[PDB]
Amino acid sequence: VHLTPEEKSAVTALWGKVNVDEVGGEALGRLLVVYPWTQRFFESFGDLSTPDAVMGNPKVKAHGKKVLGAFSDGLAHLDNLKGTFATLSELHCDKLHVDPENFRLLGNVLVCVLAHHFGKEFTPPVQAAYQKVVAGVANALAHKYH
Amino acid sequence: KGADLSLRLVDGVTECSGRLEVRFQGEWGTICDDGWDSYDAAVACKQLGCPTAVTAIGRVNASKGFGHIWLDSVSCQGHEPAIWQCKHHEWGKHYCNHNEDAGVTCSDGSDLELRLRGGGSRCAGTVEVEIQRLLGKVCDRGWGLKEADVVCRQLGCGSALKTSYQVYSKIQATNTWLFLSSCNGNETSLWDCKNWQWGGLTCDHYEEAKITCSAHREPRLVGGDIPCSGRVEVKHGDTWGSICDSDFSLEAASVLCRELQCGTVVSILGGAHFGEGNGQIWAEEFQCEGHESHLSLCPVAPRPEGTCSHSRDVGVVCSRYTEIRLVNGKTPCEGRVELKTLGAWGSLCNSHWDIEDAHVLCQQLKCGVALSTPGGARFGKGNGQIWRHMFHCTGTEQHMGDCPVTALGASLCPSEQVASVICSGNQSQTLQLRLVNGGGRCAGRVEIYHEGSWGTICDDSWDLSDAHVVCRQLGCGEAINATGSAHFGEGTGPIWLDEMKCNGKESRIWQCHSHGWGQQNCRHKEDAGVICSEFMSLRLTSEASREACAGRLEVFYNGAWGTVGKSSMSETTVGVVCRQLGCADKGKINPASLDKAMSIPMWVDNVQCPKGPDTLWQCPSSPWEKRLASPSEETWITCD
Amino acid sequence: GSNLEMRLTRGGNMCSGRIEIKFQGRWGTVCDDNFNIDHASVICRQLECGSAVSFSGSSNFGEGSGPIWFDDLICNGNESALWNCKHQGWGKHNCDHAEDAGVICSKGADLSLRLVDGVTECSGRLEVRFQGEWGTICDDGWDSYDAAVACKQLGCPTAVTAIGRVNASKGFGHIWLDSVSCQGHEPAIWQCKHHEWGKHYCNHNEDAGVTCSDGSDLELRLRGGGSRCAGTVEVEIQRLLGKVCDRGWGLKEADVVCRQLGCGSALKTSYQVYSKIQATNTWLFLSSCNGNETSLWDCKNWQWGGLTCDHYEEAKITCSAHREPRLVGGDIPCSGRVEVKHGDTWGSICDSDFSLEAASVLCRELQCGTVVSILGGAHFGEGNGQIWAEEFQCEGHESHLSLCPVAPRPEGTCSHSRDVGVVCSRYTEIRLVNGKTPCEGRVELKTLGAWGSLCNSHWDIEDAHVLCQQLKCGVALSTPGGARFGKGNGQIWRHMFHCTGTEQHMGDCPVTALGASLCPSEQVASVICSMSLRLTSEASREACAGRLEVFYNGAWGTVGKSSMSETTVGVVCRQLGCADKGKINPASLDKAMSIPMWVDNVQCPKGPDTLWQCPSSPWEKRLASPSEETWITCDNKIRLQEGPTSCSGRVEIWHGGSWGTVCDDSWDLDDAQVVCQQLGCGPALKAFKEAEFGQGTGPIWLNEVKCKGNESSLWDCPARRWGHSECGHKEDAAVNCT
Amino acid sequence: VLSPADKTNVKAAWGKVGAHAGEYGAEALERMFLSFPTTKTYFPHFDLSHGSAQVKGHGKKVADALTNAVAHVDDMPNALSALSDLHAHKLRVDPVNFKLLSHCLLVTLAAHLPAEFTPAVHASLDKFLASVSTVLTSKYR
Amino acid sequence: VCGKPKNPANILGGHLDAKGSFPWQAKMVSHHNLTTGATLINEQWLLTTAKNLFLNHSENATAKDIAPTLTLYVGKKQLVEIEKVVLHPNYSQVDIGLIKLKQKVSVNERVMPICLPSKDYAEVGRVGYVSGWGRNANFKFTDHLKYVMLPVADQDQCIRHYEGSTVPEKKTPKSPVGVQPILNEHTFCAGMSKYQEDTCYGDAGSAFAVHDLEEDTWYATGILSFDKSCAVAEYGVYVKVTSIQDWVQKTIAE
Ligand code: HEM
Ligand code: HEM
Ligand SMILES: *[C@@H]1O[C@H](CO)[C@@H](O)[C@H](O)[C@H]1NC(C)=O
Ligand SMILES: *[C@@H]1O[C@H](CO)[C@@H](O)[C@H](O)[C@H]1NC(C)=O
Ligand SMILES: [Ca+2]
Ligand SMILES: [Ca+2]
Ligand SMILES: [Ca+2]
């Protein structure tokens, strides 16, 4: 359904305050650490075994950064996500064949890293809104390959 | 190429618009709009040889296709010579349905029209668009301040202030919708906003985005002696009209003066006080509450059909004086301060001058911070009169007219003691005790803002030396009375200091010997207050009438009541008296009642105030001189 | 034969590992089913590896491989070889390879215990050296028996043994032992029962520690509560100061602490704002011990340091011994000068610093009932020594004076000439005589200094029940009639009590002694438990001067002029609210009317507030002669204090049983004129404010007094409600009239 | 799964939570009712509003159950058996919901306890709540 | 035809069945909306487990009770009815039922049975592929078919992982999962993946498929019986197909 204005507004204002050069890469490497089987898709990077290796490897944050940007574009246009991500969805889904459920796993670990940085100011309504956003994202991203 | 490829448009408004169908091996089929973008549309328009200045996606009057979807996830760079040379997965393998069939409309720009309908002017209402002579509306889905601002800009009405609807004539639902996903906002036209969609898709069952921009009804004041005073005329649409005095509330005048940045409303004047207007009178009452930022957001009510005449045009006077300038600076942000009063420019006296006053001056002139206040006629003395107005700013006011001003009795300013300022000139340079309820800055309960809160002083050990420290610290002259026992009523909050024993030489109250912050045994019934020598108050005294607002005008100053001299007193002054007492707009000077056995001290005569000031205290006069009035010099007035 | 070989495999050395036996050239293992220390002792002897240290299942050495050679062995351990242990035969087993036993012997183990980072050699973190490496033990289950074993092994004193790590860091590396729980008699910690070696879930934040002490260094004190019996509980252990965390801190633990300091019982976790003390970073945690312990150190399983608690900050206590009242120098224990012991010193209280509510609460805590009067001017004699400079600004509902807030007196010396005295309402001096126990007997009351038997004419079992209950003897079983315990040789008291049977003290029952009927000498009570007053004047409207008349049995009558003391006059005037004292006037000869008298010779001690409590002659209606009528005048309800004359001074008025002041709010020359004029001094010259004649005492009875100056009396003037004042004694009104 | 390392980490992290576990449990539940409104259909008679006593107490229960679980973590099914049957059979709770509340509970502990939420613990905590939500689900039918 | 998938291969893990590489997998749904697996064993018969068939039912249920409550899908979205079901006479040790179809299914690129083996392929270390429709990491039924590769584990290690000892009179249930698996000579065990992937609720009924590279033929070596593992316990347990071949041939003949 459509997002009520004060949800999207609290979301965007927070994403504004979100440091865009670190969080995404930590969320990604965290997905790598908690559910190690995703390393298979990224295994061109190197050893994805220790937390220090994952957190340090410059290609992990390079990818996380580009994905977080793509998500910024999502938050930008929240009613039409499918078309905006249609090609990215093809890259990951058609060429790579990532299972779309791990998008939500990452999105969930993302909200966790989000909550990690923002502590008490990340409130149950704000979480419920970001969950709605990263949901709509996960779905649009999962739209290919029915 | 390959196995016989061709592209055509079907069910278009023209041969180069419509749903796009590709013939492959002899059969026609459609393409899904999955990933269909402006580069794809541009390639399609280019291949048909039509103008590509404006290219819309979507199917206008075009049916849904049938059969095969040959291409999917088309992604052109715009240089491809044909759509089947762009990237795609393969041919005939798809998940798309015929509801997602791509369509195009290619245009040269000559037919797209934009207008506002139903908002009472051409610059407020529902956003209606006409594309290929088909009317539709912009959907509120994806509608932000950027899209509204682009639309507002295209009509040359400035910026969008509100997405509000205004109850007027309602427009037939258009079944065709335009979706804009987003523009940056620097575009000249909404159609220049990228990737806008015309028809096909359904927005959402909520629709009919309506807007009011800052140019919907534009007020101005005409014919007053200062820019913040005059008759109100409002342009609605492209026509200016006067407003009737019945149709313009105090709240609406407050909104206007705030919007005009003229401060607070000082007076509303009926009866064409600034002269009759000319032309149209608006038949709408603004029933705003008065907290609204703009008259464009105030509700309008239809006239009960009452005929107003220009003899009833409303006039407003607001509080700010704006005519201040710097003279003989090397830059416009330095110079001698000259003020225009009574129509004449004159140098301001420096006798009560400081960096906060200069800061306020530099800020009002948009010159940033004051860098120095050079003493002496460094910018020259000027050849004019020296204005002896003493401002008493806190340094936080935005305009000098918002600052307290005293001109009565001000000492003679030496010719070399003129105010001057050097401002930084760059808007990037930046950088308490009060009396309450005393009827002026120099009397009341003493409240101090300390540690983030206002608090009171106990009357324990409260003496004349402590009051003298307070009065001196505020520039209020000498202490006349140190009142205890909550004479001005009980204060609220903490009592910060108690058993005060100032020697009278301390620059700050907390430098006096005290028990220390917050250690006190008093209650607010013992809160101390002061009345200093610079407390001024006005009254009318009558011996013969219970009319509190008709009598001889006496001012209390420097501890005594005295009469005002009738010499040079104008009917403007009478208007001031009648407004200040809240009695009426006008009155007459009565002959004085000779039956009075007592000569009174007079303090000042020849007091001449312009139109605008609400209190006699604001009216220029002669210096303070205590003389005995003759009964013939007493001014007795009766307000209507 | 010589075809039997033994080795230990995978235990890091030749004296630790899984048991492998070579038989017919094949190695195989032994299951741990029915395996014990005697098997390990055989193995450790065979390898010359010393004593057995541990046996374990496959978990510590992993599964073996091959045949299981022996199973369900039953040896006593006195065998030359393991194959001499009882066995079912080679290759007979029920075990799998998950039950392969392994052992570690002392020569392959190498165990030592030390303390690290202690304040002394007998405190610190416990570290064990094993096979050359040092590691810690987790405190999961670490108890006082373990600490006692550790102290014994170190040769340290075992009189007092604490757990925990004082200033000791977290360990690193291996945690070798976990949840050790022996019986306490074992000679070494590795001889107690424990889990499998090297198998643990603990981390290095959990490290056991001990402090061994003889008790000579453990100190306990309260700081910041103004006395040794109130404040934050500070402890000093091995010269380290710390505080008790409130987690698990209840009134029972606080009462244990209060008892250890000899401060009586803990009354409240209250904090008292007095000293702001530096945070101690070290906390003591308790674990719910019963409260009947004599010392906090006698509480079980208390932990000294090592844990952080968050939301559980500073624990402070106020015990009853923070301030202990007593009454000194009165004729009965519930009357006297108030002295309060604060800390270890007794002090008097100033008459300005002790309200009626505080005296009521104090005697109630002392169980002496309600306040009858406050008496300034050292009425009960001078106190001695220090005077407390603190005002109790209590409301009077507090259970103990320790709970009412106190404010420090602003700089000023009180002297014992202004010591406050209080008398409250209960009579406590009642006794049983000739009982077999002190809680049965004939009831004797002491009045006028003499003990006497109470008459039984109305003495029922409910009254006796209340007395025995007061004496904590339970219920009354009988009220034997007659002098079964003898009549006594003294006077018989004819006092009539009117208890409901629910009162806690005999002094709470209404008492009448005036006119009470006689009692025959043999009708004495014994038990075995398990009216209107007026002054009449014919010629003046004066409620406070006149002939004393009592309404009784439906008629007003005079009191006969006989045996009335100034104490009796004080009683009548207090009940009438006139003054403490007064004088007997000559009777007015101008009255021709003879009045019925009901009672005479009424003699009451000091203490009673009402004439009903005053002993007298029986009721007898006789005609008074005009010469026998008693006319009295008590002094005025209004006085001037500390002025140079009797008509200048601070204004004090007697109301509600206390003296009090007048606020200068609305105080004017006409109010002062009325008060002095009522005293018959001439015109008012000045109304002074701000206690010009010194500060007064007690309640500010009147505020916003607004006389017209033509009223006969200040009681006739419009004023605020009696006893409701916002003013302080700083605002006490004063006058000087001609 | 659940190596020694994991087990140790989960215990050490769940200790430092202590008595606040209850209020978090309720905060966790509140988030869940806000995030996934369908789970409200499992609590008909409960007052679901902010800080409701019923929510707060049930949360104190889930908290103490969890602490119990971590006290002896090496056998979960004996300890949780009665809750197995309570949610599994009688209440028939759809297994997606445990993973919902699990994740909300991870967000909650993250938000309120930033310093301890290093990746290793986020890992073994998620594994731990997996293992539990499984033991509760495996008697579903 | 046995063992010739059109696109041969190269649960909460990876390896999405993107090309439809396991055409013998069928998806059965119970009356109470639960999805489980089944294995096509000829053009008219499929193998599954008795427990799967006994879902949403009492422990004392017959064939006519269970038969009308099932729903069955083959391939992608092709509904297939059911003629009858034949349960194994023993269910405490052979958790197996056969379903017989009313008509022959059409065989093509997307729907084809796996072959029944003539050799014993259950040698320790051999890695087989299990495809499944079961629940994912979010404990929701997966949206797309997936598969994982698991190696066969040591049978005794499995016995020890579930039961105290391998010796009968010393055994006690020690399953980290409440429900106990069925372990006997008719079963074998297999460890989970090495990137930490395993089977979970709903995977039962799928084939333990072995790809024989000498002949290029895929064989159903086991049928996953205990489907309650969730990467929390260590090993899945499979029924040995060699030990039921005769019963299967008999049921098919009848
Ligand atoms: C869930 C949020 C995700 C976001 C926001 C996202 C977005 C992106 C974007 C925009 C790129 C770069 C596109 C390009 O280079 O053309 C990228 C790279 C990539 N994505 Fe994702 N994606 C997400 C999920 C995933 C996941 C979960 C995986 C694998 C498990 C994945 C697989 C990849 C790979 C392998 C690359 C790098 C390709 C290469 O190095 O050649 N994506 N992601
Ligand atoms: C770690 C996860 C969980 C634990 C430890 C747990 C445990 C409990 C406990 C202790 C109770 C209350 C028993 C009592 O007060 O007598 C309870 C009740 C209940 N639970 Fe859970 N539960 C969990 C997850 C869930 C979830 C996520 C749901 C639903 C979405 C659920 C459904 C219910 C219901 C319907 C009740 C009945 C409430 C009542 O009887 O008062 N459980 N569970
Ligand atoms: C203030 O003081 C002056 C004398 O200094 C006195 O005349 C005047 O009445 C006072 N004002 C009052 C009491 O309000
Ligand atoms: C513990 O305290 C003692 C006594 O002050 C000191 O000697 C010792 O170094 C301390 N140990 C630490 C801080 O580890
Ligand atoms: Ca495209
Ligand atoms: Ca045995
Ligand atoms: Ca122990």
PDB file of N, CA and C in Angstrom, chain E residues 74-110:
ATOM      1  N   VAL E  74       2.509 -31.497 -10.256  1.00  0.00           N
ATOM      2  CA  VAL E  74       3.718 -31.949 -10.923  1.00  0.00           C
ATOM      3  C   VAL E  74       4.251 -30.800 -11.775  1.00  0.00           C
ATOM      4  N   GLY E  75       5.506 -30.938 -12.203  1.00  0.00           N
ATOM      5  CA  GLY E  75       6.117 -29.946 -13.074  1.00  0.00           C
ATOM      6  C   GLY E  75       6.044 -28.560 -12.471  1.00  0.00           C
ATOM      7  N   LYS E  76       5.489 -27.604 -13.212  1.00  0.00           N
ATOM      8  CA  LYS E  76       5.420 -26.234 -12.719  1.00  0.00           C
ATOM      9  C   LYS E  76       4.072 -25.897 -12.090  1.00  0.00           C
ATOM     10  N   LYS E  77       2.983 -25.965 -12.857  1.00  0.00           N
ATOM     11  CA  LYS E  77       1.667 -25.715 -12.283  1.00  0.00           C
ATOM     12  C   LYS E  77       0.617 -26.681 -12.813  1.00  0.00           C
ATOM     13  N   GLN E  78       1.003 -27.914 -13.117  1.00  0.00           N
ATOM     14  CA  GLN E  78       0.085 -28.866 -13.730  1.00  0.00           C
ATOM     15  C   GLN E  78      -0.588 -29.688 -12.638  1.00  0.00           C
ATOM     16  N   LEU E  79      -1.901 -29.524 -12.492  1.00  0.00           N
ATOM     17  CA  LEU E  79      -2.622 -30.281 -11.479  1.00  0.00           C
ATOM     18  C   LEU E  79      -2.701 -31.735 -11.915  1.00  0.00           C
ATOM     19  N   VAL E  80      -2.471 -32.648 -10.981  1.00  0.00           N
ATOM     20  CA  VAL E  80      -2.627 -34.070 -11.246  1.00  0.00           C
ATOM     21  C   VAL E  80      -3.482 -34.718 -10.161  1.00  0.00           C
ATOM     22  N   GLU E  81      -4.484 -35.494 -10.572  1.00  0.00           N
ATOM     23  CA  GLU E  81      -5.393 -36.152  -9.639  1.00  0.00           C
ATOM     24  C   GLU E  81      -4.684 -37.364  -9.027  1.00  0.00           C
ATOM     25  N   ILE E  82      -5.442 -38.287  -8.431  1.00  0.00           N
ATOM     26  CA  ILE E  82      -4.882 -39.476  -7.787  1.00  0.00           C
ATOM     27  C   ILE E  82      -5.831 -40.653  -7.969  1.00  0.00           C
ATOM     28  N   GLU E  83      -5.299 -41.806  -8.385  1.00  0.00           N
ATOM     29  CA  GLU E  83      -6.174 -42.971  -8.451  1.00  0.00           C
ATOM     30  C   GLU E  83      -6.284 -43.668  -7.102  1.00  0.00           C
ATOM     31  N   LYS E  84      -5.152 -44.045  -6.507  1.00  0.00           N
ATOM     32  CA  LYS E  84      -5.195 -44.688  -5.199  1.00  0.00           C
ATOM     33  C   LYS E  84      -3.825 -44.564  -4.537  1.00  0.00           C
ATOM     34  N   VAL E  85      -3.742 -45.015  -3.286  1.00  0.00           N
ATOM     35  CA  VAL E  85      -2.516 -44.984  -2.502  1.00  0.00           C
ATOM     36  C   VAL E  85      -2.321 -46.359  -1.871  1.00  0.00           C
ATOM     37  N   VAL E  86      -1.076 -46.834  -1.833  1.00  0.00           N
ATOM     38  CA  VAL E  86      -0.739 -48.091  -1.178  1.00  0.00           C
ATOM     39  C   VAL E  86       0.397 -47.870  -0.181  1.00  0.00           C
ATOM     40  N   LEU E  87       0.038 -47.867   1.097  1.00  0.00           N
ATOM     41  CA  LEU E  87       0.972 -47.767   2.206  1.00  0.00           C
ATOM     42  C   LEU E  87       1.760 -49.057   2.407  1.00  0.00           C
ATOM     43  N   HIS E  88       3.014 -48.910   2.818  1.00  0.00           N
ATOM     44  CA  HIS E  88       3.825 -50.064   3.184  1.00  0.00           C
ATOM     45  C   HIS E  88       3.206 -50.762   4.393  1.00  0.00           C
ATOM     46  N   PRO E  89       3.065 -52.086   4.377  1.00  0.00           N
ATOM     47  CA  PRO E  89       2.443 -52.781   5.517  1.00  0.00           C
ATOM     48  C   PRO E  89       3.081 -52.467   6.864  1.00  0.00           C
ATOM     49  N   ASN E  90       4.355 -52.087   6.869  1.00  0.00           N
ATOM     50  CA  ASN E  90       5.055 -51.673   8.078  1.00  0.00           C
ATOM     51  C   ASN E  90       5.340 -50.181   7.994  1.00  0.00           C
ATOM     52  N   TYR E  91       5.043 -49.443   9.070  1.00  0.00           N
ATOM     53  CA  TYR E  91       5.396 -48.034   9.101  1.00  0.00           C
ATOM     54  C   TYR E  91       6.283 -47.633  10.263  1.00  0.00           C
ATOM     55  N   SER E  92       6.581 -48.527  11.202  1.00  0.00           N
ATOM     56  CA  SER E  92       7.542 -48.140  12.220  1.00  0.00           C
ATOM     57  C   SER E  92       8.971 -48.164  11.712  1.00  0.00           C
ATOM     58  N   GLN E  93       9.238 -48.897  10.640  1.00  0.00           N
ATOM     59  CA  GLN E  93      10.572 -48.940  10.074  1.00  0.00           C
ATOM     60  C   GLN E  93      10.688 -48.481   8.633  1.00  0.00           C
ATOM     61  N   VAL E  94       9.637 -48.580   7.824  1.00  0.00           N
ATOM     62  CA  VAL E  94       9.714 -48.123   6.439  1.00  0.00           C
ATOM     63  C   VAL E  94       8.706 -47.001   6.202  1.00  0.00           C
ATOM     64  N   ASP E  95       9.127 -45.751   6.434  1.00  0.00           N
ATOM     65  CA  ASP E  95       8.197 -44.627   6.342  1.00  0.00           C
ATOM     66  C   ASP E  95       7.878 -44.359   4.878  1.00  0.00           C
ATOM     67  N   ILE E  96       7.062 -45.178   4.232  1.00  0.00           N
ATOM     68  CA  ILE E  96       6.897 -45.096   2.782  1.00  0.00           C
ATOM     69  C   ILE E  96       5.478 -45.408   2.327  1.00  0.00           C
ATOM     70  N   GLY E  97       4.993 -44.614   1.376  1.00  0.00           N
ATOM     71  CA  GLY E  97       3.785 -44.939   0.645  1.00  0.00           C
ATOM     72  C   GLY E  97       4.007 -44.712  -0.837  1.00  0.00           C
ATOM     73  N   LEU E  98       3.261 -45.464  -1.645  1.00  0.00           N
ATOM     74  CA  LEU E  98       3.192 -45.258  -3.088  1.00  0.00           C
ATOM     75  C   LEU E  98       1.841 -44.698  -3.513  1.00  0.00           C
ATOM     76  N   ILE E  99       1.855 -43.705  -4.395  1.00  0.00           N
ATOM     77  CA  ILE E  99       0.635 -43.163  -4.983  1.00  0.00           C
ATOM     78  C   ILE E  99       0.561 -43.617  -6.436  1.00  0.00           C
ATOM     79  N   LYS E 100      -0.603 -44.127  -6.837  1.00  0.00           N
ATOM     80  CA  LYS E 100      -0.896 -44.533  -8.205  1.00  0.00           C
ATOM     81  C   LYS E 100      -1.864 -43.539  -8.825  1.00  0.00           C
ATOM     82  N   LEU E 101      -1.529 -43.088 -10.031  1.00  0.00           N
ATOM     83  CA  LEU E 101      -2.328 -42.149 -10.802  1.00  0.00           C
ATOM     84  C   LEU E 101      -3.367 -42.821 -11.686  1.00  0.00           C
ATOM     85  N   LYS E 102      -4.458 -42.087 -11.939  1.00  0.00           N
ATOM     86  CA  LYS E 102      -5.531 -42.611 -12.776  1.00  0.00           C
ATOM     87  C   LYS E 102      -5.085 -42.779 -14.221  1.00  0.00           C
ATOM     88  N   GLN E 103      -4.346 -41.808 -14.749  1.00  0.00           N
ATOM     89  CA  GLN E 103      -3.815 -41.881 -16.099  1.00  0.00           C
ATOM     90  C   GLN E 103      -2.313 -41.646 -16.100  1.00  0.00           C
ATOM     91  N   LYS E 104      -1.688 -42.055 -17.198  1.00  0.00           N
ATOM     92  CA  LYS E 104      -0.273 -41.814 -17.409  1.00  0.00           C
ATOM     93  C   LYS E 104      -0.019 -40.322 -17.611  1.00  0.00           C
ATOM     94  N   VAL E 105       0.983 -39.804 -16.911  1.00  0.00           N
ATOM     95  CA  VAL E 105       1.435 -38.434 -17.105  1.00  0.00           C
ATOM     96  C   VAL E 105       2.180 -38.369 -18.430  1.00  0.00           C
ATOM     97  N   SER E 106       2.023 -37.257 -19.140  1.00  0.00           N
ATOM     98  CA  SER E 106       2.835 -37.011 -20.323  1.00  0.00           C
ATOM     99  C   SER E 106       4.275 -36.714 -19.926  1.00  0.00           C
ATOM    100  N   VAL E 107       5.222 -37.355 -20.604  1.00  0.00           N
ATOM    101  CA  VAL E 107       6.644 -37.218 -20.306  1.00  0.00           C
ATOM    102  C   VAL E 107       7.252 -36.195 -21.256  1.00  0.00           C
ATOM    103  N   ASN E 108       8.058 -35.285 -20.717  1.00  0.00           N
ATOM    104  CA  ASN E 108       8.674 -34.264 -21.556  1.00  0.00           C
ATOM    105  C   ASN E 108       9.925 -33.739 -20.850  1.00  0.00           C
ATOM    106  N   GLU E 109      10.378 -32.557 -21.273  1.00  0.00           N
ATOM    107  CA  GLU E 109      11.579 -31.941 -20.717  1.00  0.00           C
ATOM    108  C   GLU E 109      11.415 -31.574 -19.247  1.00  0.00           C
ATOM    109  N   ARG E 110      10.193 -31.268 -18.815  1.00  0.00           N
ATOM    110  CA  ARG E 110       9.966 -30.757 -17.470  1.00  0.00           C
ATOM    111  C   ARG E 110       9.473 -31.804 -16.484  1.00  0.00           C
TER     112      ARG E 110
END
